[PDB]
Design a protein around this ligand. Structure first.
Ligand SMILES: [Mg+2]
Ligand SMILES: [Mg+2]
Ligand SMILES: [Mg+2]
Ligand SMILES: [Mg+2]
Ligand SMILES: [Mg+2]
Lengths: 104, 296, 93, 64, 274, 113, 348
RNA sequence: AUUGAAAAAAAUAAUAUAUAUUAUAUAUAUUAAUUAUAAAUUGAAAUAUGUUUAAUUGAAUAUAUUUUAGUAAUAGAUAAAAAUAUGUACAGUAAAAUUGUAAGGAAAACAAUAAUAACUUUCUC
RNA sequence: GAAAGAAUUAAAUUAAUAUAAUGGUAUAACUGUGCGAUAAUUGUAACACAAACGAGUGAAACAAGUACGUAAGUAUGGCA
């Protein structure tokens, strides 16, 4: 009951014709969070990428960084909808109003 | 001198004395063998000639000897006639070559060689040697030494006197000397008058100049002139040079110049389209009649 | 020269606008054709690529502009700065 | 009853045959062996007709 | 066969012989793999490697200074123990097994210029257990390893038989790839640059992990592989993704040397050491 | 004919495969063959020379360490014990990072913590 | 440019063909390859890109390194060190490679491959060590030629043989090959190619051919018979084809006798052995030695005692085999020998 | 051979031609191919013939012809999971146990686990 | 001082051997691979082990043909 595609007669790679596998790759530039760019040899066909979050903006990798901007995936939620739909009620002064319930 | 079977049974291969021994080459392995003689210690020294036994005896009886000599493998028996026929075929070829060489020596040239048979045999051997990879100096000696052999050997077996060997060897020396200085082969293993190496260089240069100035081949008379120049070229050119020159000058299709390529007249051979990768378009090059060596 | 063929039939699905944009972005190879002579040899194309030579694949979203490797400290020849030589090792003398 | 006895007849019109065993439906057996009356190695084909088990051929050429 | 008895005849010369070079068959294996004339030829130094350079520039001398112990000596490993000669039964007795282990352990040499902890290989193990039913999914593993690592993946087939797990022996389930040289360097760099700094609860590599004599291993979950550039670009064509095992082999004699070494390549550690 | 999953996997297997996806063998003229050999020979020598230079530097560095250790031990054992202490848990500062092909927008930081 | 100058370096360290040199040293990709002759093939050929610039720098890199080695070679005095330094200086010259790999190494011409130059000597040694030496010793080993005749062999000089007079066809004999009685009926020649630095104005060689397979019905065993023997043969790195030109009747200690096997006497192995005479110093000119023809059994010949008595060191060897055929009788009568004996087909 | 560039050659081996010998050798010429093999209304590309725009010529453009797409694993003389269990030639060494690794645990897959005295080559002080 | 190679030494026959047990096997008889499908052929078989006879086991050698191997040589089914 296993899903297995039937195997065809394997072609004979006789001795001496064993060519290496050289997969098509592109000299692709990787743009980090900062202006740092590293050239990476990749198969996917497009030359530049931006990394929204990377080692640059990770506290674990930069313990000494006092200022560290943080950005996460933008699919929907706070940064997307909670902000534009609630663009009047403002502040962390306001966070001190709901600071504690003063309950044991 | 011992074997082993399917059941790992050890059995002797030659008569002798069975000894159990240990070979230093194979530690942790007992051995059994058969020394060819009682006084022989079986782990024979490595770097000493192996003790072999001929065993087989000689057939003194005349009838037994006759039977054995005339007893050959089926491969040899079946191949007996074919090889003999080829030998007869080649012997006839040698005979014809000898006849042809003698005719040209006496007729094409006017050299009075005293020994027709000896002179021809020297030359046919030289030709065969030259056909095979052999420089001219080596080829002449090889044939020379061969003839001088079968003469010292002939003297030994026929108990000839020293003087007879000396005169025969001298006679061979002069005939070869005369042949070398008066006969030669021209790029095809064909006999002709001797040509000096320095003269060969001079003739080669003259042909190269005479062939360079006439490379247009506009008219069939020029074609004949060029081909005529390639008549005695074999006398002073090696085959590699001869083929190279023909390829350079006897081009089947001449370079396409303005005269050779034209479309104003009709029946310009055929369209003869090709492809150009500069403009990435198909091209039409209608060749003219005076652009092919075959027609011109 | 030994590079393999690019499997465009996998990354670029059939009918995708990006797929058809890439096709136009590329330049096709010359194909073998009976009755036409070729000086450099009969074309050998498989999976839409000549097998006798290399293959060229032409490829906010602002363009990636790498920063210059020569800084202001380099041109100004300032010695106190820590950026005078980015690719080297600086020692405090 | 699993094995069977078959008579391999020399391809040369020699009349010399050799017998071998085989499974109930193994492929047709064809072997080269020495034939004494011709003094050479010749093919040996089956004499009678046997019901060979059906097998699927290999698709060396890409199909569908 | 008349007999089954292997016995090589001794020779009478010192010249080393190799029947491969003097057999006319296979004229193309005679050429070395690196040779241009071989069909197996593949360029090696296409471009410079930044990670390797970093190790040879900065971390090389640093590690020598770190690990150096003054007048340290070689610590012999647990070897086989010889039989003390006090009975006539020890003449051919095989030696005893090591003290606490059934396998001999290697010696630990002091760190010097010649031996400085450094990388040597990285192996990706991917065992899709779900392939027991759908074999076709094992191919997706090879593609995933190929796209990410960038090298040809060698497939992984079953070896054991556990009925409780519906495990059958002799079926393909995963792929593995051996990485060395520059390509391994790129993988290690792109792992720490991109994939690692994208897990929400990531703390680092456990200090308890690692073979006693060099070698450190960790594992990436199914969702972590989506962070690779070559899957993030084509999420449409990657409906299913699944984890793998990573093993970094190094020239470190002991583990703690390797951990210090890998830390230079931007690897974090969180647990407590042994 | 065949399930869509099989079609997709066949394509993925196709990307793996080498069928009708490789060029003709690289053939070089006899003289370019000698050209290539001399190129590689220089590169082999050049890499060996760089490697030997690094090894020789490390030779001297170790020589310097031990002479420093020997002198520190004879003069002031109080500091020597601290110097010879193990570094089992030593870790490079994570702020140090492998060089990048091109510099960042901010080259350096003058504030810490 | 040490490699460019020719004030003292031999001309052999150069490409004789000008067109080849011009392309190999071309500054721009403007000359087509010489090797490919047909212009159609010339058009089809495509050189790899960026191969000229890197080659030029690679050439310079080696050029400087060669210059350093030559300077070092100038200041030394030991000939063995001097030869090693020279080989080390020029082994990387592209011209030297082109000259060697691409032209005959056996029948080398003095213009291209000169064996007086240390570099070509070294390259030839390595080449012969790759295939020729490896094949020779296997033939001598598996044929039991070594222990039967000599304790061992340590090759130092390629040896090749031929029978140009017998039939007139040129073919270098592969070791261990099977030869008819006609082919080996007249005489062998030798090409003792040396590769080790040796004083070729003083050193002398000997050549012996032995057949340790002649039946000995007295002891029901075999005995070794000397086939052909030459002593006091001079040699030269580039002219080392021993032939009747290069030796006289004084050198022949045993005139050549053809391989003449007997019917059903089994295969007979003819092992060519090439030694070198002792080199005694404190004397001008070669050390001619007078062989003792007195004993010289040539019927029951003991090579081991012969070598020990005259202090000869073996450097090369060759082997061929012969069996009975129809031509043996003709050979016997040609050389005036008794008719061969006929043996049985079985051993008892 | 014609096809953009302005006398040749001196290796092994392959191919084509020829011929010397009771020798599977020599002479000349040139360095092919090396992952393929039928079957596609439909996808892609290409050349040729016209048109429109924009001499030439860029783009689009209709047709004819052809080529790519049948997309399928071994790329290593492969080496302890499965299939060819008798011949020959070449080559290699298993297994347990231990330490680790996302699911993974006692049991799935991967990695590591005895010592370099002497020798050759290369680089280097 | 370093890199590579040839490798050496120790341990190992507990894994594996179509199949029980025993003996053998790393020089592998175990495993991988190219060619192959050939010797899983054909007439004389001396001589031995074993043995009451009938039978059984190993096999030198002569002759014909085939496969592999550059060659030496191996193959008359399976390590016994
Ligand atoms: Mg068995
Ligand atoms: Mg057992
Ligand atoms: Mg008895
Ligand atoms: Mg009986
Ligand atoms: Mg077997």
């Amino acid at each position: 009951t296993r899903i297995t595609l039937p195997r065809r007669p394997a072609k004979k790679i006789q001795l001496g014709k064993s060519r290496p596998a050289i997969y098509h790759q592109f000299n692709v530039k990787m743009e980090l969070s900062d202006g740092s760019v590293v050239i990476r040899r990749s198969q996917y066909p497009k030359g530049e990428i931006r990394l929204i979050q990377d080692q640059r903006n990770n506290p674990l990798w930069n313990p000494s960084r006092d200022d560290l901007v943080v950005v996460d995936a933008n699919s929907g939620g706070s940064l997307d909808r909670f902000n534009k739909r609630y663009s009047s009620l403002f502040s962390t002064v306001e966070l001190s109003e709901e600071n504690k319930k003063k309950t044991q | 001198n011992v074997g082993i079977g399917k059941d790992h049974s050890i059995f002797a291969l030659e008569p002798g004395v069975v000894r159990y021994y240990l070979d230093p080459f194979h530690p942790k392995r007992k051995f059994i063998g058969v020394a060819l003689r009682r006084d022989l210690k079986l782990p024979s020294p490595h770097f000493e000639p192996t003790v072999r036994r001929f065993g087989r005896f000689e057939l003194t009886n005349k009838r037994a000897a006759y039977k054995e000599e005339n007893s050959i493998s089926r491969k040899d028996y079946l191949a007996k006639p074919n090889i003999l026929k080829q030998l007869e075929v080649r012997e006839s070829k040698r005979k014809e070559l000898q006849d042809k060489l003698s005719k040209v020596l006496r007729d094409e040239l006017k050299l009075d060689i005293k020994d027709i048979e000896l002179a021809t045999s020297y030359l046919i051997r030289v030709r065969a040697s030259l056909k095979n990879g052999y420089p001219i100096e080596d080829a002449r000696f090889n044939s020379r030494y061969y003839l001088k052999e079968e003469e010292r050997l002939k003297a030994r077996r026929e108990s000839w006197t020293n003087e007879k060997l000396s005169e025969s060897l001298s006679k061979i020396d002069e005939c070869s000397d005369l042949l070398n200085s008066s006969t030669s082969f021209n790029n095809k293993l064909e006999l002709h008058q001797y040509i000096s190496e320095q003269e060969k260089q001079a003739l080669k240069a003259k042909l190269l100049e005479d062939l360079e100035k006439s490379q247009h081949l506009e008219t069939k008379k020029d074609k004949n002139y060029i081909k005529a120049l390639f008549k005695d070229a074999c006398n002073f050119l090696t085959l590699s040079e001869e083929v190279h020159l023909r390829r350079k000058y006897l081009k089947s299709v001449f370079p396409e110049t303005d005269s050779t390529v034209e479309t104003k007249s009709g029946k310009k051979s055929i369209v003869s389209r090709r492809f150009d990768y500069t403009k990435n378009k198909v091209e039409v090059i209608a060749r003219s009649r005076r652009a092919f060596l075959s027609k011109l | 020269r030994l590079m393999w063929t690019f499997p465009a039939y996998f990354y670029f699905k059939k009918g995708t606008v990006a797929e058809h944009k890439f096709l136009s972005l590329q330049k096709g190879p010359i194909s073998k054709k009976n009755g036409i002579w070729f000086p450099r040899g009969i074309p050998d194309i498989k999976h839409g690529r000549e097998r006798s030579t290399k293959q060229e694949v032409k490829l906010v979203n602002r363009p990636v502009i790498p920063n210059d490797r020569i800084t202001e400290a380099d041109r100004s020849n300032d010695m106190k700065s820590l950026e005078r030589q980015l690719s080297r090792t600086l020692y405090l003398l | 009853s699993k094995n069977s006895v078959i008579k391999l007849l020399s391809t040369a019109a020699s009349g010399y045959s050799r017998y071998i065993s085989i499974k109930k439906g193994a492929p047709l057996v064809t072997q080269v062996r020495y034939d004494p009356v011709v003094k050479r190695h010749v093919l040996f084909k089956e004499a009678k007709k046997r019901k060979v088990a059906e097998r699927k051929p290999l698709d060396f050429l890409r199909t569908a | 066969p008349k007999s089954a008895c292997s016995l090589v005849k001794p020779v009478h010369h010192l010249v080393k012989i190799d029947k491969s070079k003097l057999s006319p068959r296979f004229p193309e294996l005679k050429y070395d793999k690196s040779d241009i004339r071989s069909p197996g030829f593949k360029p090696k130094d296409t471009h410079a490697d930044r990670l390797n350079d970093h190790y040879l520039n900065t971390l090389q001398s640093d590690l020598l200074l770190i690990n150096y112990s003054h007048n340290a000596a070689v610590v012999k490993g647990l070897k086989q123990r010889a039989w003390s000669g006090d009975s006539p039964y020890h003449l051919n007795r095989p030696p005893k097994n090591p003290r606490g282990s059934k396998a001999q352990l290697p010696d630990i040499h002091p760190i010097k210029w010649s031996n400085i902890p450094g990388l040597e290989s990285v192996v990706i193990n991917c065992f899709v257990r779900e392939a027991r039913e759908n074999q076709l999914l094992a191919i997706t593993a090879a593609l995933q390893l190929q796209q990410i690592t960038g090298c040809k993946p060698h497939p992984i087939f079953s070896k054991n038989d556990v009925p409780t797990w519906k495990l059958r022996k002799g079926h393909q389930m995963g792929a593995k790839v051996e990485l060395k040289g520059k390509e391994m360097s790129q993988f290690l760099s792109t792992l720490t640059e991109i994939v690692l700094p994208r897990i929400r609860e990531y703390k680092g590599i456990s200090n308890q992990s690692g073979n006693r004599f060099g070698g450190i291993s960790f594992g990436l979950t199914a969702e972590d592989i989506k962070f690779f550039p070559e899957i993030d670009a084509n999420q449409d064509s990657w409906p299913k993704t699944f984890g793998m095992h990573i093993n970094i082999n190094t020239s470190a004699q002991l583990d703690y040397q390797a951990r210090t070494l890998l830390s230079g390549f931007q690897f974090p550690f969180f647990g407590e050491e042994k | 004919s065949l399930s869509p999953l099989a079609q997709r996997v066949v394509t993925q297997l196709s990307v793996m495969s080498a069928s009708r996806k490789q060029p003709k063998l690289l053939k070089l003229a006899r003289e370019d063959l000698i050209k290539h050999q001399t190129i590689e020979k220089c590169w082999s020598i050049y890499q060996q020379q760089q490697r030997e230079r690094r090894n020789l530097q490390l030779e001297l560095q170790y020589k310097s360490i031990e002479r420093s250790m020997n002198l520190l031990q004879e003069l002031s054992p109080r500091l020597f014990e601290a110097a010879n202490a193990s570094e089992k848990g030593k870790r490079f500062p994570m702020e140090m990072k492998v060089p990048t092909d091109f510099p960042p927008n901010t080259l350096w930081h003058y504030n810490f913590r | 440019h040490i490699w460019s100058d020719f004030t003292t370096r031999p001309s052999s360290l150069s490409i004789q063909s000008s067109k080849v040199k011009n392309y190999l040293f071309q500054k721009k990709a403007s000359l087509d390859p010489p090797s490919i002759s047909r212009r159609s093939n010339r058009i089809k050929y495509s050189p790899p890109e960026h191969i000229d610039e890197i080659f030029r720098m690679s050439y310079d890199f080696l050029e400087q390194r060669s210059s350093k080695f030559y300077e070092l070679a100038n200041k030394t005095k030991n000939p063995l060190k001097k030869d090693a330094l020279l080989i080390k200086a020029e082994i990387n010259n592209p011209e030297v490679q082109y000259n060697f790999q691409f032209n005959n190494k056996l029948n080398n011409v003095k213009d291209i491959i000169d064996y007086d130059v240390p570099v070509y000597r070294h390259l030839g040694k390595q080449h012969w060590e790759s295939y020729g030496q490896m094949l020779l010793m296997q033939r001598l080993e598996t044929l039991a030629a070594i222990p039967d005749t000599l304790p061992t062999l340590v090759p130092r000089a390629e040896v090749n043989i031929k029978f140009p007079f017998s039939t007139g066809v040129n073919k270098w004999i592969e070791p261990g090959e099977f030869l008819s009685s006609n082919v080996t009926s007249m005489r062998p020649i030798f090409k003792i190619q040396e590769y080790e630095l040796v004083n070729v104005e003083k050193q002398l060689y000997t050549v012996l051919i032995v057949n340790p397979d002649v039946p000995d019905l007295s002891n029901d065993s075999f005995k070794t018979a000397l086939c052909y023997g030459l002593v006091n043969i001079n040699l030269t790195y580039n002219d080392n084809l021993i032939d009747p030109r290069k030796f006289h009747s004084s050198n022949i200690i045993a005139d050549y006798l053809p391989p003449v096997p007997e019917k059903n006497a089994g295969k007979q192995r003819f092992v060519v052995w090439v030694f070198r005479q002792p080199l005694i110093e404190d004397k001008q000119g070669p050390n001619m030695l007078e062989i003792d023809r007195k004993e010289l059994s040539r019927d029951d010949f003991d090579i081991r005692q012969f070598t020990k008595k005259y202090n000869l060191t073996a450097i090369g060897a060759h082997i061929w085999r012969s069996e009975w055929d129809a031509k043996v009788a003709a050979v016997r009568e040609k050389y005036g020998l008794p008719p061969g004996r006929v043996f049985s087909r079985v051993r008892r």
